[PDB]
Amino acid sequence: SPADAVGQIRQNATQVLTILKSGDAASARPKAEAYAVPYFDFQRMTALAVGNPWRTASDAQKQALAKEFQTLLIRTYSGTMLKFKNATVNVKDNPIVNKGGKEIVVRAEVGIPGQKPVNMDFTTYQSGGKYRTYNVAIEGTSLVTVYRNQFGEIIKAKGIDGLIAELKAKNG
Ligand SMILES: [Cl-]
Ligand SMILES: [Cl-]
Numbered sequence: 252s253p254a255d256a257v258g259q260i261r262q263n264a265t266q267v268l269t270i271l272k273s274g275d276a277a278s279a280r281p282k283a284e285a286y287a288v289p290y291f292d293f294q295r296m297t298a299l300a301v302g303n304p305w306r307t308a309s310d311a312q313k314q315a316l317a318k319e320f321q322t323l324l325i326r327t328y329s330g331t332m333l334k335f336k337n338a339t340v341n342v343k344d345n346p347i348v349n350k351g352g353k354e355i356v357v358r359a360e361v362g363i364p365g366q367k368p369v370n371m372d373f374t375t376y377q378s379g380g381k382y383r384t385y386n387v388a389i390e391g392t393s394l395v396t397v398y399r400n401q402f403g404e405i406i407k408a409k410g411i412d413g414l415i416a417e418l419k420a421k422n423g
């Protein structure tokens with residue numbers, strides 16, 4: 252049911268935060284990343300970042316884009332997680348249902364001491380018995396679609412293979 256999504260996000264948030272402030276950072280950050288990874292659908296998330304060109308890409312191109320984008324996202328935000336590891340989370344008890352009920356958005360209030368709270372919206376769908384997240388928004392801004400313009404400019408100039416090659420170079 253839709254309420255299961257809220258419960259799972261609450262558990263995910265509790266687990267991630269527990270891992271982060273329970274060990275040395277050098278090992279706790281990798282453990283938190285690895286715990287969180289299978290709860291994201293990076294293929295759907297990459298489709299959202301790339302936009303319309305995603306549908307034209309071959310399977311080999313889609314998979315390469317999703318792999319490199321997952322790595323980019325993890326490098327971009329992993330240290331940021333650790334910075335805010337002492338956060339309060341309050342998950343809005345009711346979720347938002349979209350797309351005929353195939354898409355469940357769970358909202359969470361995240362409180363960093365000294366900071367105004369931010370809405371963190373997780374756009375999920377049911378896969379198996381769990382809910383997997385393919386969009387994350389903070390203060391109403393997606394962390395995912397924010398790449399659409401730049402990825403679009405790279406694709407027009409350099410193609411889907413050019414974007415793949417670009418991401419691979421950014422990931423060092
Ligand atoms: Cl995935
Ligand atoms: Cl190909």
Ligand SMILES: [Mg+2]
Binds near residue numbers: 342343344
């Ligand atoms: Mg609550």
